[PDB]
Amino acid sequence: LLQQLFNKFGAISSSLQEILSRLDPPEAQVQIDRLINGRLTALNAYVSQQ
């Protein structure tokens, strides 16, 4: 479960620090949203298995 914080899920980077220090606020939203979707999907699958 901790390994899912290092996948990119289609973004340019897995780190939010490296996204927010490189892009405009209108263009960081498209990159942050993919990480949000991937991490919520990983949490959903974990909760189902428990």
Partner 1 sequence: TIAGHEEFIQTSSPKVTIDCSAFVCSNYAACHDLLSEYGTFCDNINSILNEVNDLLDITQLQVANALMQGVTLSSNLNTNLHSDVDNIDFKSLLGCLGSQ
Q: Which parts of this chain interact with partner 1 (CB under 8 A)? A: 3-4, 6-10, 38, 45, 49
CA distance 50 to 40: 16
Shortest spacing between CB 45 and partner 1, in angstroms: 7
CA distance 10 to 27: 14
Shortest spacing between CB 11 and partner 1, in angstroms: 9
The helix (run of H) or strand (run of E) holding residue 30 is helix 25-49
4 or 23: CB nearest partner 1: 4
Identity (one letter) of the amino acid at 19? I
Shortest spacing between CB 19 and partner 1, in angstroms: 15
